[PDB]
Symmetry: C2
Subunit: 55 residues, 2 copies
């Protein structure tokens, strides 16, 4: 899980195999940087954009 | 779509019928507040936490 963007010191826009994701972790931005792998101990909430409804 | 949390001036943690969501919109925080409906013209990216994989 890399960091494609930065929302704040906890939320960041990441990207997974499926598509773009969002990593919300208190202090996630701290101890990491853009393009760096996301720290799993800091992973508090993983969000993914709705790709498809039923299809 | 209400605003349960605020990530920055564009990203905010919202909540839909399915579960918690994330609204990433440049200026989304501006022209709105916590618990207020999210402006659709500002909606740039909607993210939802992975509820279930296959089940």
């Amino acid at each position: 899980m890399k960091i494609k963007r930065i929302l704040n010191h906890n939320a960041i826009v990441v990207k997974d195999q499926n598509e773009e994701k969002i990593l919300l972790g208190a202090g996630i931005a701290f101890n990491k940087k853009k393009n760096d792998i996301v720290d799993p101990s800091k992973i508090e909430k993983t969000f993914i954009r709705k790709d498809t409804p039923d299809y």
